[PDB]
């Protein structure tokens, strides 16, 4: 069959959130209060495209 199409390693470069899980869980309620709109754009794009290659931006 066909060839799978993957993004380059340059397209997977981003400044990661290099904190621990207790740092995230401590900040999680204000993170859900404040970072609402890009998170829900991403999860809508993620449940609609059903493909993590269409959701990288």
């Amino acid at each position: 069959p066909g060839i799978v199409e993957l993004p380059s390693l340059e397209d997977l470069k981003v400044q990661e959130v290099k904190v621990s899980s207790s740092v995230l869980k401590a900040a999680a309620h204000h993170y859900g209060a404040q970072c609402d709109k890009p998170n829900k754009e991403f999860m809508l794009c993620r449940w609609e495209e059903k493909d993590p290659r269409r959701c990288l931006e």
Binding site: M43, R46, W47, K50, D51, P52
Partner: peptide, 8 residues
Amino acid sequence: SPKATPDN
């Protein structure tokens, strides 16, 4: 329905 994980 929308399931627990999106890739399906």
